[PDB]
Amino acid sequence: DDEFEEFPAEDWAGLDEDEDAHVWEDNWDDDNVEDDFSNQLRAELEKHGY
Amino acid sequence: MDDKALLVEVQLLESKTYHALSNLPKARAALTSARTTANAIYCPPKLQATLD
Amino acid sequence: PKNPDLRIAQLRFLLSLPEHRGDAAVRDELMAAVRDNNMAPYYEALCKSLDWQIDVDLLNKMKKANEDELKRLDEELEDAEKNLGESEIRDAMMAKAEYLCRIGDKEGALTAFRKTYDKTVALGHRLDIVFYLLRIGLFYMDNDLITRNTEKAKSLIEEGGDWDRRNRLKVYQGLYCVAIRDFKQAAELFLDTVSTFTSYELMDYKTFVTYTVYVSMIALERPDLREKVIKGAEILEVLHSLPAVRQYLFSLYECRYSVFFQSLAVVEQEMKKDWLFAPHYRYYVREMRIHAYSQLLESYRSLTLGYMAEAFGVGVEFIDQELSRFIAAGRLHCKIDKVNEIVETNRPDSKNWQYQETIKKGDLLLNRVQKLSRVINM
C-alpha cells in the first residue's frame, strides 16, 4: 500500500489538546448564537399586546 | 392482623387513589387483591356494593 | 452516597447569563462539605472562588486531622487482619470514596477499588465503582472510564445476577446525544426501567421521571409515544405529582403549541442548570422546536404564516426566520413563501422516498462493491 509520501504527511503539530475530545457527533447548527426563548416571545408580542 | 374488613377498606381506598392517579394497572392489581381478601370475609352489603 | 451533584455545576460554573456563582446553593455544597470534611471540592476553590480566605484552611486543619485519623483506622484494620474478598478493604475504599474522592481525588480511590476488585468476587462492588466514577467523571469530565466500566459490567459482569446496569445509561443521556443518544437508547432503557426504579442512589424518582419524559418526547415525537409515555401508568402518576412536566408533555401531544413553547422555555432554563445543561440544552431545545414544527406542518398542505404565529406562540417574522433556518439545515420538509405568506409542505410520497432511499443505499453498496472488486484481481 502506498503511503503517499509525495504529499507531505501533515503532522498534527504535537497532538495538542483538542476542543473536547468528546464522542459527540454534532451538526453545523450547534455553533450559532441564541438568547433563550421567553425573552424572544415577550419581546415580539408586547408590541401587539402581551 | 386478623382484621380484614378494615383491610378491605384500606385496599379499596388504595385502589381508588391509584385510579385517581391514572395508575390504572396498579389500581386494578390493588382492587383484585381487595376482592380476593373480601371473598373470605363477611363483606357487608355496603362493602360489597362499594367493591363492585 | 453523593446525590445532589455536589451542587458544583450550579456552583460558579453557571456564571454570566445563568449567573449562578453565589447563593444558598454554595451553602448546601458547604454543608455537604463540612460533614465528612473534604478538600477535593476545594481544589478549584483554592484557585478562583474563596481562594485564600480564612475558612479555606480553618476547615482544612481538622479536615486533615479527621481524614488522617480515619485513614489510620483503615490501615490498622487492613494490616492487623487479613480479611478476604468483600472485606474491610472494600470498606476502606468505599470510605476512600466518601473520603479522598471527597478529600482530594478519585485516583487513589480508583486504584484502591481496582485492587479490591482483583480481591473481590461479587458484582455490586463493580457497579458501585461504575456509578462512583460516573459521577466523579461528571465532576471532572470523564467518559472513557464510564464506558470501560459499563462494558465490563454488561458484557462480562452481567452473567450472574441482573437488573442493575439499566440506569447507568445516564451516561448515554450525554454520550452521542446531539445526534442520536439524547434519545432513542437513552429513552428505551429509561422506559424499560421506570416501572422498577430501585436506584434511588443516583437520583430521586421524580427527577428520574422528568428525565424519562424529556428524553422520550425527543426520542419519540408521535410514533405512538402514548403507548409507553402517555398511557404509561407510573409516568402518569409522577406527572400528577409534577404539573409542569405533565403540561409540557401533553401540550406537545395535544397540539397546544402556544403553551408548548412556554413549557419548552421553562424546560430549557431548568435544563440549563444540571448535569444535563452543558451537554445539550441548546440541542434539545432545537430538536423539540423542529419536532413541534414538523408535527404542525404534517396534516397540512399550505399554512399561512399568520396562522402559524397565532397558533404556535408568536412571531410571524420569528417563525419565518426559524423555518428558514431549519429548512436550510435539511430537516423540516417544507417550503416557505414570502409576502404571499404561505408555507408549503413538500413531503414526498412513499414511492418517491422509497426511490430516493434506493438510490442512496444502492450507491453506498455500489461504491463498496466497486472498491472491493478493484482491490481484488488488481
Decide if C306 contacts A48 (C-beta within 8 A): no
Q: How many domains does chain A have?
A: 1
Question: Resolution in A, one decimal?
Answer: 3.1
Give the chain C residue nearest B25 (alpha carbons): C233
Cα C313 from Cα C12, distance rounded (Å):
34
Q: Which helix (H) or strand (E) holds C264?
A: helix C257-271
Could you tell me whether strands C335-336 and C302-304 are parallel, antiparallel, or unpaired per DSSP bridges? unpaired
Residue of C258, C310, C314, C320 to mutate, interface with A, max A Cβ within 10 Å: C314
DSSP code for C226: I
Distance CA C37, CA C68 (A): 11
Neighboring chain C residues of A24 at a CB cutoff of 8 Å: 175-178, 279
What secondary structure letter does DSSP report for C304? E
Distance from CA of C232 to the nearest CA of B (A): 8
Do the beta carbons of residue C194 and residue C210 sit within 8 Å? no
CA gyration radius for chain B? 11
Nearest-Å Rg of the Cα atoms of chain A is: 23
Q: What is the DSSP-derived secondary structure letter of residue C14?
A: B
Cross-strand pairs, C342: C304
Cα torsion through C134, C140, C143, C147, rounded to 10: -30
* Cα dihedral across residues C139, C143, C149, C153: positive or negative: positive
Q: For residue C148, what is the DSSP state?
A: H
Lookup result for grid cell 424519562: C212
Could you report how far apart the first and last alpha carbons of chain C are, in Å? 63
Contacts of the segment B24-33: beta carbons below 8 A, 24+ positions apart: B24/C233, B25/C233, B26/C233, B26/C234
Closest CA to C206 of C162, C259, C169, C243: C243
Tell me the CA distances in angstroms from C364 to B26, C344, C368, C373, one per residue in order. Answer: 50, 31, 6, 14
C335's grid cell: 417550503
Provide the grid cell at A5.
509520501
Cell representation of residue C343: 408555507
Whether C112 contacts C96, CB under 8 Å: yes
C-alpha–C-alpha distance, residues C292 and C312, integer Å? 9
> Going by C-beta distance under 8 Å and a sequence separation of 6 or more, which residues neighbour residue C345?
C297, C298, C300, C301, C302, C333, C334, C335
Task: Return the C-alpha cell found at C118.
Answer: 482483583
What are the φ/ψ torsions at residue C133 (nearest 5 degrees)? -85, -15
With contact defined as 3+ CB pairs under 8 Å, the chains touching C are: A, B
DSSP state of C228: I
Q: Which chain C positions have a beta carbon within 8 Å of A28's beta carbon?
A: 329
Q: How many Cα neighbours within 13 Å face the side chain of C7?
A: 15
Domain range for A24: 1-48
SS3 C342: strand
DSSP H/E element including C335: strand C335-336
Shortest Cα distance, chain C CAs vs residue A34, angstroms:
8
Which H or E element spans position C344? strand C342-344
Which residue in C has a C-alpha nearest to residue A50's C-alpha? Answer: C314
Q: Do C265 and A38 touch (CB under 8 A)?
A: yes
Phi-psi map region of C273: left, alpha, beta (phi>0 left; psi -120 to 50 alpha): beta
Task: Give C-chain residues touching A25 at CB under 8 angstroms.
Answer: 176, 178-180
Chains A and C touch (3+ CB pairs under 8 A): yes
Burial C122-149 (b: 16+ CB within 10 A, else e): ebebbbbbbbbbbbbbbbeebbebbeeb
What are the DSSP E strand ranges found in chain A? none
Nearest-CA distance C220 → chain A (Å): 20
What is the CB-side half-sphere exposure of residue C277 using CA atoms within 13 A? 17
3-class DSSP state of C346? coil
User: Among C301, C303, C324, which Cα is nearest to C312's?
Assistant: C303
Order the strands of the C335-336 sheet from edge to edge. C302-304, C342-344, C335-336
